Write a structure and sequence with these properties.
about 10% helix; 4Fe-4S; High-Potential Iron-Sulfur Protein, Chain A; binds iron/sulfur cluster; about 80 residues; alpha+beta
Length: about 80
Amino acid sequence: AAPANAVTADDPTAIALKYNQDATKSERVAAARPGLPPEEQHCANCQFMQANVGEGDWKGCQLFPGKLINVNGWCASWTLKAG
Ligand code: SF4
């Protein structure tokens, strides 16, 4: 079950960024964002995931203030976690 503040499929920004809480149900291959092969991309290896926000599999994303994403998710702003 998702937290009460999970990003939902109906969120305008989630729709624009093609977020899904499950990267295996995402269009990461179509987008071909740079930095890793697409099949390797998900929130846990993204620069915007906030490891100090949330609990467990439900962590912050800087692009979704006040909400939580799933570490196993993906969106089209995926960017390699570089620091
Ligand atoms: S920006 Fe990164 S951490 Fe945030 S939802 Fe998209 S892939 Fe996940």
